[PDB]
C-alpha cells in the first residue's frame, strides 16, 4: 500500500511524532495536482481535535515532495497534535486530504494507533475454526443471558480478507481492546468471538482493519435491532455513526390459530405507507384503522418498506439494514402485534422489499469501500462499484445479483421475514434492477436478460420453499420476462394508472382499460388504477378535468365510482393505494414526490358515497367469490371506440351466475337497453330488455342473483 496513506513509523505511536505521506493513484482527484494539500483529521470514532472544515494553518499543510506525493509531520506527538489527554486511549486517527478551498477531498479513512502509555499494545490476530456448523453461520447467536457469539463474514471478490477485527460496545466503553479481537476461520471466511459476562441491552459495532483499506466502524448486518445516529437520542456517544447493533439476551411476543389469506388466487391488496396512513405515522396509529380496512373488505395490506432505512422520514426505498425493521414505526413486538391483529381481522400482510440497492450505512457497503470515489470497492463481493443500469441509480450501493453471497443473503432475509414476522407474501421493488448488463437507457435495460429471469426464479422458489402459499409479486415492467415468469407463478404489477386517470378526467384518448385483464394468465397480474409511484386520479380531475369533472365534487365521485365498477368487477388480483376509496386528491408532487402527505380521514365522511361503492364492490368478491374465478367467462368493451354509447362488462361463472356493468364516462346521459333476463341492482329486482337513461358519469351494476 504505497497508493493512499503511508505512515512512518509504520506502526503509529500515540506519544511519538508521525509523518503521513499521501500518494495520489492514477485517475484520482489529486493525480497531477500542482499545489499543496491539507489534512482534515481527528482521533477515535468521533474525530476528537478535528479542525473547522477548511482551516489552512501551516500545521494542516501536506507539502508536495514528489510528483503525486505529499507529506505532513504531526510534531511533538500524535497525542500533542490532537490535544488529547495523556490517560485517554489514542487508538485511531481519521484522515481526509483536501484542496485549500475544501472542495476536492478524499473520504472517511482511519488507521490504527498503538498507545503503550494506556496499555493498548497490538497483538497478532489468532486463527481458530468456527465452533458451529450449518446454514446461517454469520450474524448474532445468543448462548445465554450473559453470552453472545458474533460471526462476521470476510472475503472480498479477489479472495482476500482484513488483517484484524475488534468488537467495541457498552461492555468495554467503546474502546479497541486485545481481549475483544475476533479470531479468523480461513475455511469459513468468518471472524468470530464469544462475548461472556454481559450484564438486558448489549450495544456493539465492529472496527475492521487492513493495511490496504485502513479502519472502518460498522454494525452487524444480521442485527434485529439498531440505533441510528441523528434519529435515536440514546445513540451511544462512544459509537461512530451510522449504526450500533442492539441484542437483548427479552420478552418474546406470544402469537394468538392458523392463518390463510382470503381469495388467495385473486386478492384485493391495500398499499399502505405507515408514515402517511395516520397522524401518528406508525404501527400504533395503523392498528386503530384495522376495523375500517376489514369492513372495506380487503384481503391483504402491502406495507411500503419497513426494513431499517436512512433517517425516520421516507417511503423507505433506502434500506441500510435488512434483518432490523425501522424503530420509527415501532418495536419488533409492535410489528408482530400489528401483523397478528391484521390476521385476527382476516387480513394478510405483504412486505415491500428493496434488493436492487442498499445505502452507504449498510455493513456490506462499509466492509469494502473506495475512500477515493466514495462508493463500494471493486473488491466488494455483494455490491458493484458502479451501477451497471446507468438510467436508474437510486443509491451508490447497487447489489450484484450474480454474486453467490448476494443471492444467499437475499434468500436468508426472505426466510427470516417469513419465520419471524409471520407475513403472507412479498412485493419485490424494481426487479428490472436485478441485472449486471451495462445499459444507459430504458430499451437496453428492458431487453431480456436471461440471468435476471434466472435469479428472479431463484428468489421466488426460495420463498415457496419456506411458505408454499406465500404470495410473490414483482414490480418488473420487462414485458417479455413477465410472460416467461408469470408461467412460474410470479405475480406482476400491471400499471393501469394512465387509462383510469384519462377516464377519471373524462378524456376518451388513452383510456383503454383492457390491460387490466391478461387473457392468458389473468390471476398473475396485480392491476391498479393507483400506486404510491403514480399521480392520483382524483387530483388529475382538479388539474385537467373535462368540464364539471374539474370543480363538481358530486360528478367527480360518480366518475371515480364508474372507474371502480370497471376495476373490482374484473378477474385477477387488484391493488388500491391508501385513500383512493375516499377520492384522495392531493397531488403526489405536493411537499415533493416522496414528502409527507396530508392525512385526510375527514374524506371518509365528505366522500362517504365513494367509500360505500369501493366497499360493496370489494365485498362482492368475497360474498360471490365463485363469480371471480379465472375459469369464469370475461368479456368487456373498454376501447377508444367504447365511449359515446358507453362501456360494458359481462362476467359469467361455470355455475350460471352473471354480473353485468354499464358505465357512461361521457358528460351527457346515454340511453341503454338492459340485456335480456331477470337482474338485480346488487349495490341497492329489474326486468331486462328495458330501455334506461344512464346519467353522465354513472354506472349500472346487474347480477342474475339476489343476495
Ligand atoms: Ca432509520
Ligand atoms: Mn441493480
> For the residues of 64-122, what is the DSSP string, one character each?
EEETTEEEEEE-S-HHHHHT--TTS---EEEEEEE-TTS-SB---EEEE-BBGGGTB--
Q: Which ligand is nearest to the CA of 451?
A: 2
Distance (Å, whole) CA 698 – CA 613: 12
Q: Which ligand is nearest to the CA of 393?
A: 2
Q: Which ligand is nearest to the CA of 438?
A: 2
- In 522-646, DSSP assigns E strands to 525-528, 574-577, 633-637
CA of 694 to the centre of ligand 1 (A): 52
CA of 398 to the centre of ligand 2 (A): 5
Distance (Å, whole) CA 182 – CA 220: 13
CA of 438 to the centre of ligand 1 (A): 31
CA of 224 to the centre of ligand 1 (A): 13
Strand, coil or helix: 594:
coil
Q: Which ligand is nearest to the CA of 452?
A: 2
Which alpha helices (H) appear in 311-421, and where do they start and end? 332-344, 363-367, 404-421
CA of 394 to the centre of ligand 2 (A): 9
Beta-strand relationship, 92-98 and 69-74: unpaired
CA of 311 to the centre of ligand 1 (A): 4
Q: Which ligand is nearest to the CA of 439?
A: 2
| Core vs surface per residue 456-467: b (16+ CB within 10 A) or e | beebbebbeeeb
Cα–Cα distance list, 464 to 339, 458, 460, 473 (Å): 20, 10, 6, 12
- In 464-622, DSSP assigns E strands to 471-474, 491-495, 525-528, 574-577
Question: Residue 689 — left, alpha, or beta (φ > 0 → left; ψ -120 to 50 → alpha)?
Answer: left
Distance (Å, whole) CA 219 – CA 367: 10
Concatenated DSSP letters for 165-220?
EEEEETTTTT---GGGBPEEETTTTEEEEEE-----EEEEEEEEEETTTEEEEE--
Report yes or no: 229 and 237 within 8 Å, Cβ to Cβ: no
Distance (Å, whole) CA 305 – CA 319: 8
**Cell matching residue 368:** 469494502
Concatenated DSSP letters for 253-305?
---------TTTTS-EEEEE-HHHHSTT-SHHHHHTTHHHHHHHT-SEEEEPP
Q: Which phi and psi angles does 706 have, rounded to 5°?
A: -70, -105
CA of 595 to the centre of ligand 2 (A): 24
CA of 361 to the centre of ligand 1 (A): 10
CA of 396 to the centre of ligand 2 (A): 10
Distance (Å, whole) CA 460 – CA 451: 14
CA of 135 to the centre of ligand 1 (A): 28
CA of 452 to the centre of ligand 2 (A): 10
Q: Which domain holds residue 307?
A: 268-627
CA of 363 to the centre of ligand 2 (A): 18
Q: Which phi and psi angles does 590 have, rounded to 5°?
A: -65, 125
Cα–Cα distance list, 550 to 67, 504, 505, 535, 537 (Å): 68, 10, 8, 16, 12
CA of 596 to the centre of ligand 1 (A): 16
Query: Which residues on adjacent β-strands are paired with residue 19?
Result: 8, 73
Q: Which ligand is nearest to the CA of 399?
A: 2
CA of 327 to the centre of ligand 1 (A): 7
Q: Which ligand is nearest to the CA of 275?
A: 1
Q: What is the C-alpha radius of gyration for the chain, rounded to an integer number of angstroms?
A: 30
Distance (Å, whole) CA 702 – CA 174: 70
Residues, beta carbon < 5 Å, ion ligand 1: 228, 326
Q: Which ligand is nearest to the CA of 226?
A: 1
CA of 320 to the centre of ligand 2 (A): 16
Q: Which ligand is nearest to the CA of 434?
A: 2
Q: Which ligand is nearest to the CA of 314?
A: 1
Sort 640 into a burial class: Cβ within 10 Å, 0-12 / 13-18 / 19+: exposed
CA of 424 to the centre of ligand 1 (A): 24
CA of 156 to the centre of ligand 2 (A): 19
CA of 447 to the centre of ligand 2 (A): 15
- 234: DSSP letter: T
CA of 612 to the centre of ligand 1 (A): 37
Residue with cell 434500506: 319
CA of 400 to the centre of ligand 2 (A): 7
Neighbours of 265 (CB within 10 A): 16
Cα–Cα distance list, 545 to 195, 316, 552, 603, 632 (Å): 65, 32, 10, 20, 36
Concatenated DSSP letters for 497-531?
HHHHHHHHHT--TT---GGGS-SS-GGGEEEES--
Give the torsion sign (CA, 64, 65, 68, 73).
negative
Distance (Å, whole) CA 665 – CA 507: 9
Q: Which phi and psi angles does 566 have, rounded to 5°?
A: -110, 30
CA of 326 to the centre of ligand 1 (A): 5
Strand, coil or helix: 652:
strand
Angle at the Cα of 392 from the Cα atoms of 388 and 395, rounded to 5 degrees: 85
CATH number, domain of 374, equals 3.20.20.80
Query: Which residues on adjacent β-strands are paired with residue 663?
Result: 647, 699
CA of 191 to the centre of ligand 2 (A): 28
Q: Specify the resolution in Å.
A: 1.9
CA of 298 to the centre of ligand 2 (A): 33
Q: Which ligand is nearest to the CA of 386?
A: 2
Cβ contacts of 184-189, under 8 Å, gap ≥ 24? 184/125, 184/126, 184/127, 184/128, 184/154, 185/127, 185/128, 185/129, 185/130, 186/127, 187/129, 188/129, 188/130, 188/137, 189/153, 189/154, 189/155, 189/161
**Cell matching residue 136:** 446461517
- Provide the total of helices (H) and of strands (E) in the chain, helices listed first: 15, 34
CA of 221 to the centre of ligand 1 (A): 14
Q: Which ligand is nearest to the CA of 437?
A: 2
Beta-strand relationship, 471-474 and 425-428: parallel
Q: Which ligand is nearest to the CA of 319?
A: 1
Amino acid at each position: 500500500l504505497h497508493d493512499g496513506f503511508n505512515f512512518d513509523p509504520a506502526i503509529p505511536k500515540a506519544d511519538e511524532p508521525l509523518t503521513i505521506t499521501f500518494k495520489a493513484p492514477e485517475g484520482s482527484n489529486f493525480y497531477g495536482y500542482a499545489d499543496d494539500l491539507y489534512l482534515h483529521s481527528g482521533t477515535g470514532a468521533n474525530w476528537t481535535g478535528a479542525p473547522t472544515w477548511g482551516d489552512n494553518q501551516n500545521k494542516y499543510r501536506l507539502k508536495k515532495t514528489k510528483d503525486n506525493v505529499w507529506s505532513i509531520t504531526l510534531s511533538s506527538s500524535i497525542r500533542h497534535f490532537y490535544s488529547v489527554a495523556p490517560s485517554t486511549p489514542l487508538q485511531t486517527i481519521n484522515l481526509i486530504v483536501r484542496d485549500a478551498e475544501g472542495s476536492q477531498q478524499t473520504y472517511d479513512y482511519a488507521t490504527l494507533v498503538e498507545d503503550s502509555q494506556n496499555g493498548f499494545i497490538w497483538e497478532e490476530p489468532q486463527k481458530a475454526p468456527l465452533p458451529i456448523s450449518g446454514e446461517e453461520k454469520e450474524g448474532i447467536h445468543i448462548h445465554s443471558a450473559t453470552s453472545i457469539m458474533l460471526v462476521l463474514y470476510d472475503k472480498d471478490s479477489q479472495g482476500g480478507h482484513k488483517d484484524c477485527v475488534f468488537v467495541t460496545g457498552n461492555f468495554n466503553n467503546w474502546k479497541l481492546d486485545s481481549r475483544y479481537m475476533m479470531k479468523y476461520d480461513e475455511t469459513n471466511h468468518c471472524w468470530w468471538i464469544t462475548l461472556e459476562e454481559l450484564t438486558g441491552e448489549t450495544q456493539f459495532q465492529y472496527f475492521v482493519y487492513s493495511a490496504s483499506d485502513g479502519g472502518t466502524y460498522l454494525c452487524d448486518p444480521y442485527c434485529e435491532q439498531a440505533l441510528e445516529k441523528g434519529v435515536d437520542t440514546n445513540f451511544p456517544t462512544g459509537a461512530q455513526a451510522p449504526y450500533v447493533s442492539v441484542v437483548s439476551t427479552p420478552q418474546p411476543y406470544q402469537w394468538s390459530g392458523e392463518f390463510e389469506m382470503k381469495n388467495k388466487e385473486n386478492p384485493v391488496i391495500y398499499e399502505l405507507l405507515l408514515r402517511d396512513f395516520t397522524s401518528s405515522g406508525n404501527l400504533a396509529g395503523a392498528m386503530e384503522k384495522l376495523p375500517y380496512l376489514k369492513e372495506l373488505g380487503i384481503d391483504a395490506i402491502e406495507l411500503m418498506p419497513v426494513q431499517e432505512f436512512a433517517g425516520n422520514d421516507s417511503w423507505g426505498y433506502n434500506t441500510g439494514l435488512y434483518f432490523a425493521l425501522d424503530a420509527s414505526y415501532g418495536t419488533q413486538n409492535e410489528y408482530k402485534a400489528f401483523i397478528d391483529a391484521c390476521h385476527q381481522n382476516g387480513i394478510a400482510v405483504i412486505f415491500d422489499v428493496v434488493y436492487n440497492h442498499t445505502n452507504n450505512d449498510n455493513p456490506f457497503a462499509r466492509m469494502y469501500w473506495d475512500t477515493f470515489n466514495n462508493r463500494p470497492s471493486t473488491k466488494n463481493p455483494w455490491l458493484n462499484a458502479v451501477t451497471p443500469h446507468q438510467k436508474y441509480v437510486f443509491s451508490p450501493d447497487d447489489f450484484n445479483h450474480t454474486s453467490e453471497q448476494t443471492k444467499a443473503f437475499v434468500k436468508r432475509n426472505l426466510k427470516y421475514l417469513l419465520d419471524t414476522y409471520h407475513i403472507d407474501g412479498f412485493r419485490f421493488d424494481f426487479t428490472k434492477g436485478f441485472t449486471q448488463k451495462q445499459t444507459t437507457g430504458d430499451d437496453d435495460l428492458a431487453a431480456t436478460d436471461p440471468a435476471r429471469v434466472s435469479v428472479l426464479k431463484e428468489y421466488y422458489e426460495a420463498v415457496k420453499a419456506v411458505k408454499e402459499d406465500a404470495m410473490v409479486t414483482m414490480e418488473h415492467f420487462c414485458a417479455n420476462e413477465e410472460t416467461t415468469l408469470a408461467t412460474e407463478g410470479i405475480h406482476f404489477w400491471r400499471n393501469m394508472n394512465h387509462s383510469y386517470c384519462q377516464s377519471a378526467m373524462g378524456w376518451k384518448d388513452n383510456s383503454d382499460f383492457s390491460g387490466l385483464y391478461d387473457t392468458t394468465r389473468p390471476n398473475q397480474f396485480v392491476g391498479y388504477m393507483e400506486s404510491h409511484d403514480e399521480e392520483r386520479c382524483a387530483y388529475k380531475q382538479i388539474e385537467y378535468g373535462n368540464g364539471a369533472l374539474k370543480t363538481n365534487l358530486s360528478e367527480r365521485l360518480k366518475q371515480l365510482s364508474s372507474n371502480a365498477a370497471f376495476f373490482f368487477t374484473v378477474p385477477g388480483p387488484k391493488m388500491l393505494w391508501q385513500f383512493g376509496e375516499m377520492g384522495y386528491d392531493i397531488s403526489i408532487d405536493e411537499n415533493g414526490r416522496t414528502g409527507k402527505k396530508p392525512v385526510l380521514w375527514e374524506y371518509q365522511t365528505e366522500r362517504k358515497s365513494l367509500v360505500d361503492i369501493y366497499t360493496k364492490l370489494i365485498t362482492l368478491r368475497t360474498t360471490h367469490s365463485d363469480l371471480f374465478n379465472a375459469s369464469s367467462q370475461f368479456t368487456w368493451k373498454v376501447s377508444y371506440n367504447d365511449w359515446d354509447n358507453g362501456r360494458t362488462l359481462t362476467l359469467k361463472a361455470v355455475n350460471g351466475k352473471q354480473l353485468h356493468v354499464y358505465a357512461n364516462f361521457t358528460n351527457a346521459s346515454i340511453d341503454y337497453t338492459i340485456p335480456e333476463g331477470t337482474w338485480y341492482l346488487y349495490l341497492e329486482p329489474v326486468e331486462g330488455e328495458k330501455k334506461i337513461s344512464v346519467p353522465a358519469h354513472e354506472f349500472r351494476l346487474y347480477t342474475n342473483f339476489a343476495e
